[PDB]
From a paper:
The [name] gene of Xanthomonas cam­pestris pv. campestris strain ATCC 33913 encodes a protein from the cupin superfamily, [name], with a molecular weight of 12.2 kDa (residues 1–113) and a calculated isoelectric point of 4.9. [name] is among several gene products from [name] that have been annotated as being involved in tetracenomycin polyketide biosynthesis. [name] belongs to the cupin superfamily, the members of which have a conserved β-barrel fold and have been classified into at least 18 functional classes involved in a range of biochemical processes, including plant growth and development. The crystallographic packing of [name] indicates that a homodimer is the biologically relevant form.
[name] was crystallized in a monoclinic space group (C2) in the presence of zinc acetate and the structure was determined to 1.6 Å resolution. The final model is comprised of a protein monomer (residues 1–113 and Gly0 from the TEV protease cleavage site), four zinc ions, two acetate molecules and 151 water molecules in the asymmetric unit. The active-site zinc is within co­ordination distance of the side-chain NE2 atoms of two histidines (His41 and His80) and the carboxamide O atom of Gln46. A bound acetate was also identified in an ∼5 Å deep hydrophobic pocket and was most likely acquired from the crystallization solution. A bound water molecule, acetate and three side-chain ligands indicate octahedral coordination to the bound zinc. Thus, the octahedral coordination geometry and coordinating water molecule both suggest a likely functional role for the bound zinc. XC5357 was crystallized in a triclinic form without zinc, whereas [name] crystallized in a monoclinic space group in the presence of zinc acetate. The conserved His41 is located in one of the loops and the backbone rearrangements in [name] result in His41 relocating by ∼8 Å to coordinate with the Zn atom near the center of the cupin barrel. Comparison of the solvent-accessible surfaces (see supplementary material) indicates that a deep surface cavity is eliminated upon the conformational rearrangements arising from the binding of zinc acetate. Furthermore, a new channel is formed on the surface of [name] that is surrounded by nonpolar residues including Ala11, Phe12, Val27 and Ile28 that may reflect the natural substrate-binding site.
Author numbering:
A (entry chain A), B (entry chain A): 0 to 113
The structure:
Amino acid sequence: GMQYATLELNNAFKVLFSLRQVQAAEMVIAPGDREGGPDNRHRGADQWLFVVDGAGEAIVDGHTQALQAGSLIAIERGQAHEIRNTGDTPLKTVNFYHPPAYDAQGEPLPAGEG
Amino acid sequence: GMQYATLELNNAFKVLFSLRQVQAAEMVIAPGDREGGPDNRHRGADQWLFVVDGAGEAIVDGHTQALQAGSLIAIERGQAHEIRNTGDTPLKTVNFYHPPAYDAQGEPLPAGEG
Ligand SMILES: [Zn+2]
Ligand SMILES: [Zn+2]
Ligand SMILES: [Zn+2]
Ligand SMILES: [Zn+2]
Ligand SMILES: [Zn+2]
Ligand SMILES: [Zn+2]
Ligand SMILES: [Zn+2]
């Protein structure tokens, strides 16, 4: 069969599915808001963050990058990261964790913890 | 530092970067075209395919799914897959291979071969 989902891209944070130690999640940040911070790390999981729409700013270990549709970040395990919505529409992202970072309640696994 | 790229989302196929045995690639399929087929497999790499924009159809081991922005497929290693553009605008996708499937010339690695 096919392992498939159409992301609604309207959830603050929603864990989607996994396959062989990669896990997908949706994260949509409202205008004027941010997720993570200068002390926000996943000690054992890389996070591949892709911007589907909107405008924002990533700070990754003190390095700053403007975000737009098409922006891709490979956030290595252990790197502090913050994602800020700097526009006036939702900042829509899809995220790939390797290995997985979150349990079925959307709580961090040991690998997803700081 | 930050491992970052803004995808142009206008290349038929462009390998992007890797981190710790996950590799990203852009694939944009022109109207009336298709990539892969009923015999198209990566024997040793899963492929996570995400649709950024456009409209299409995936066939994965004979299973059919309409594709739109937000569509996510986890195409397991060994699964036959074909992606057809069924609209009249480009079908823009980003792809995550685990383990990596392609070398620096965009040719399949052993894991990316059928
Ligand atoms: Zn602090
Ligand atoms: Zn994170
Ligand atoms: Zn490292
Ligand atoms: Zn792995
Ligand atoms: Zn055939
Ligand atoms: Zn493929
Ligand atoms: Zn399997």
